[PDB]
Every structure is written in C-alpha cells, then in structure tokens.
C-alpha cells in the first residue's frame, strides 16, 4: 500500500497473509480474505504459480511475533474457470483456497462480510484497501499491515478515456487514483473494505495497477468485484 497508515491490529480481522515456501522460510506474496473458517478468497494471479502456500491469520507484523498468529496450510486451490494468466484485464481474477484446518475465530480472526450479489457502489464511496504490499512503486513490502483510504470511481468514470478506458470491465471495482495512495505489489488478493449501511463489507479483491506505477493519477487501483461472483463462491464452497 502506497500512502497508507498503519492499521490498528484489530481493525481488519478478515485480512490474511498468503505466503509461499522459499528455501527454509516463508515469504509473503499476497493478501486474502477469510470468508469461512476453512476458506480464503484471494486473486487468481496470486496462486497460478507452482508453489507451496500457507495462510496466516491474525497477522499484523510480518517480521515480529504478535502472539496472535495462526498458521495453516492450503489444501485445495480453486481458481475461477475463466481466469487466464496472460489476460489480467479480462477479469475473473479470483480464487478460493480451502485450508487444511479450520482456524479459530477471535478479535484478530473473523470472517469477512461479503456484499449481496449484484451490489454496485455509488461513485466516491468510502473504502479502505489493506495489505503488506510495497509502500512505494518498485519499493519494498511493509512490515506492519497498512491501510489507505481509496474512494470508489464508478464504472462510467473509470472506463472513460482519461482513466482506464476499456481496460476496466464491469466485473471490476476501481478505487483511488489520487496519485498518492494506492495498492501495490504484495497487496493483490487482499480486500477492499467499503462502508455500507454502517457495516464494512469486502467489495473487492485487489487485482492490478498501471504499468506507469502503483500510485498514478487517474489510474485507480483495480479490484475484482466480489458481488459479481457471489454465486460462483457459494457454488465452490458447497461442492467442496
């Protein structure tokens, strides 16, 4: 997250760190949202690599013991059937991970609330992106969970020539683009929390940014629109 602030350790309990085994250690690669005690929602591009993954819930500082972490392996990965690794702009950047064990819920580990199918946010809706991603374009990962206020940019505006044009699809949510704050490498797969009816719900799965950089004016961070996949999500969980 570029231009973020450190999140309080109990603000976003559904946020998880998706890590892969590298040598004798583990490396954070993406974010994710805990949606069931044994299911995590993330981006398809985060797991279309042949690596061994683990999920860490109740995480705050990637480099220090917080005394709240739970580590669990990934048992099954279900990527959306239409996902194409070399066509991120097409959409379908979403995947579900079934955990080897069911995590224990507490103040640091909670299920993320998903919006009702078809829900579209009004332009400039209040949302926060969270993650341990790079704090600057071509920079380095954050040690502590970061959050950044990223108001939504509706489809009509986001798909206009000055913004993303046809690159953005209606199956996506755009947020930010003020040139100062944005998601960045390492935040992918994580949540975009938006306040609706007094409750925060996860409306997006962090997907991509501009080739020009993470924080680029009129190039808001792009997320997979969760409300466009509610049926798919329920179908996968119910059959696995």
């Amino acid at each position: 997250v570029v231009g973020g602030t450190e999140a309080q350790r109990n603000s976003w309990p559904s946020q998880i760190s998706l890590q892969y085994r590298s040598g004798s250690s583990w490396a954070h690669t993406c974010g994710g949202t805990l949606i069931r005690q044994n299911w995590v929602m993330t981006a398809a591009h985060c797991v279309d690599r042949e690596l061994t993954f683990r999920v860490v819930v109740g995480e705050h500082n990637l480099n220090q013991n917080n005394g709240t972490e739970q580590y669990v392996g990934v048992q099954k990965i279900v990527v959306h059937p239409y996902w194409n690794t070399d066509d991120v702009a097409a959409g379908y950047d979403i995947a579900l991970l079934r955990l080897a064990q069911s995590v224990t819920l507490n103040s640091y580990v909670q299920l993320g609330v998903l919006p009702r199918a078809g829900t579209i946010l009004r332009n400039n809706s209040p949302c926060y992106i969270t993650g341990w991603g790079l704090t600057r374009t071509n920079g380095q990962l954050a040690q502590t969970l970061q959050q950044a206020y990223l108001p939504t940019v509706d489809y009509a505006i986001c798909s206009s020539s000055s913004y993303w044009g046809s690159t953005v699809k209606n199956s996506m949510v755009c947020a930010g683009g003020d040139g100062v704050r944005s998601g960045c490498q390492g935040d992918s797969g994580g949540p975009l929390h938006c306040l609706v009816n007094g409750q925060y719900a996860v409306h997006g799965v962090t997907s991509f940014v501009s080739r020009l950089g993470c924080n680029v004016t009129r190039k808001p961070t792009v997320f997979t629109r969760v409300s466009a996949y509610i049926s798919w999500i329920n179908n996968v969980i119910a059959s696995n």
């Binding site: 981006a43 591009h45 991120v88 702009a89 950047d93 991603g133 690159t167 998601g183 960045c184 490498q185 390492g186 935040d187 992918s188 962090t206 997907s207 991509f208 940014v209 501009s210 080739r211 993470c214 961070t221 792009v222």
Partner: peptide, 4 residues
C-alpha cells in the same frame, strides 16, 4: 497493466 501490472498485477499486484
């Protein structure tokens, strides 16, 4: 685009 750049996946993040």
């Amino acid at each position: 685009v750049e996946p993040i």
